[PDB]
């Protein structure tokens, strides 16, 4: 991937550490059946309100050496062609070519 | 013990260049102080040189400075020794700076005199007692001003025992100004210990520490402190923690000096135990057993 | 008895009592005025620094004697430092000016 | 009882380390329960080896954690300390639980 | 009407002092001049001193100073000595378990990772705890002490802060 791509990427998880709080806050009110019709209505306005890159659904799972986002896996951060070659030259441990 | 009187953090580690619990067995990294270890990294005599403190919760005044023949703060307060210990050992009341009040600022005050006070002037009035009291009144002393009332009350008197009184009164009182000993020293707030190494712990022949007796007096006033923090806490009342502050300034006056006060107090087995002022004076102090005389290698008998 | 150097005190660094501990003789207080007595100020000087309390000055000493040297580095006693730590104990603010 | 959950990768390794901790209680304390050996865990994995496209060409990796649960029946003064200066081996995470 | 005053035992034999007290009132049949005898204790303030309902009269006054292991009243003389409050007691008595209240239903001590372990078998060391299962009482004290660097499940009780 590009640059740019990884910045973007970087900005969205930042305001995403940053508008945790709130934002949850926000959703806890919107589902608490027990409360205000007025108060929810304000809750989902405010939540509109809030940056768009602040939700943690628009944040890509990209690899953590090449910003690739397809081919991904979660327990190494890597796509799949570096993990691979990450195997290869001892660097994950544990991880070997498995055959049964 | 971390972290008790001899602690690592607060002094140094046991061993030379070695965390006593952990880590540093070489000669590369001498200071770190890991957190599983609360210990310094220096030398074995490191810890002789190096001192604690104690937070008195109380405030107590000096052994040396109240009880000298002439005592320091007898002199200086215009007070009376007599009176001096019974507001001392809360047992009397200092009034300090009343107001509009028919009191004097030296004169003190009982039971009696504090209930009847008490229910009379319930607004502008102060008259505390102890330590506290008496730091207060040292605090609140103008020297230069006594100075001047003092030299002119002096040269306003032909009364031969007045002069000879105030002239003693005097001297005192322009001699502090002249040096940088404030008045409010006097009283003991942030009590100083000894270096452990200055008060052994070794064990003689068998398994048990003969403990020098500075540690029953240093560990005495720190359960004494604790137990008067703790009562401070709780809001416990009046007559409770006035005993507790009295039982801390008995301590403290009989770590100093002990026996100076009401009979000394003894662990093992009437004997009284032997304090910091026990070690300075006497034939065997430092002065006669140890700077005067030694004892020295290279000799023969 | 006889001693050129054996075991030291914990508390203060000055040889132990005794023939039993292998001790020293205490060079006492008359001693001292009896050297003062005379010039004798060198005899002294190593007689309640070097030989007795100073830790340094006295393996400086020890160097000294095994190369043949004959020359002190007099310090300070360690006790008048155990001394100042008494005293600072206490309320009392002692110090070295200067 | 202190139950000890050790882990690694490395199965000959894990061995060695819950020897060595069966030793440390053994000396100090009494009755130990013993190396009891749990299921590892084989996490397998399949990914894609071409960099661009081939997609019946794979490598299908694994990792085999291995699980040993060694119990101590008796904790005593000294055996909390058996261990204190006996840190295991890198690459095996112990897990130690009294009760 | 009986009043309180507070009465001073060699510490450490206090529930003996107010059994021997209780006693020496119904020997000597005083019993309309004794209302109570307190020593209060939470899961022990106050660290040496009997709570006494009591009157004043120089008889009473010789019988508690007589029970055995007594030095004497605390207050502001020897000849009439002092009771203590009572507008601190409406207070205190809404109030009676202030340093053990269900106020705070799970940290006991600021865990972080500055605690020591020295309650049940694992004891006087030190560890770091990450997280902590307060709600179950439970605690991941990574403490280095006994064995490697793994997180034992300690007892809030069990350690210290
Ligand atoms: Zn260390």
Redesign the interface.
Known sequence: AKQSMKAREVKRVALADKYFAKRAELKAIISDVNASDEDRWNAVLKLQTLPRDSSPSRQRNRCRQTGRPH?F?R?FGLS??K??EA?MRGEI???????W | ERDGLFCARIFGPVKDYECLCGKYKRLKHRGVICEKCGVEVTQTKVRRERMGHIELASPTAHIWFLKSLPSRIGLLLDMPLRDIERVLYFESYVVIEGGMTNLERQQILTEEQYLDALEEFGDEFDAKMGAEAIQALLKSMDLEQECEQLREELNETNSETKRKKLTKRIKLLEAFVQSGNKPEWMILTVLPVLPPDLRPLVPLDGGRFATSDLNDLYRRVINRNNRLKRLLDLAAPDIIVRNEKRMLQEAVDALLDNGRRGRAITGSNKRPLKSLADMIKGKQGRFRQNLLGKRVDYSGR | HARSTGSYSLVTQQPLGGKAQFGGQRFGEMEVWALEAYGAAYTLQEMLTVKSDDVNGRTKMYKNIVDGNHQMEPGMPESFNVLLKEIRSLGINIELED | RIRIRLKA??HRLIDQATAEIVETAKRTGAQVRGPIPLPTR????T???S?HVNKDAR???????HLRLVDIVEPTEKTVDALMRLDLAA?VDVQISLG | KKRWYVVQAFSGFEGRVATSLREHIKLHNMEDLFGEVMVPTEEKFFPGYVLVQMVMNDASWHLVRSVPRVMGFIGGTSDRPAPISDKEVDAIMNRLQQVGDKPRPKTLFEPGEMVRVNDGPFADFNGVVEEVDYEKSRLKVSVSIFGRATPVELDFSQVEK
Do not use: M, N
Not at chain 1, 93 to 99: D, E, I, Q, T, V
Not at chain 4, 59 to 65: A, C, G, H, L, S
């Open positions: 081919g896996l327990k799949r062609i993990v691979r195997a441990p544990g991880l070997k070519k498995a055959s | 990768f490395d084989k996490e397998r994995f990914v894609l080896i960099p490598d299908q990796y694994e990792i085999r954690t690459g």
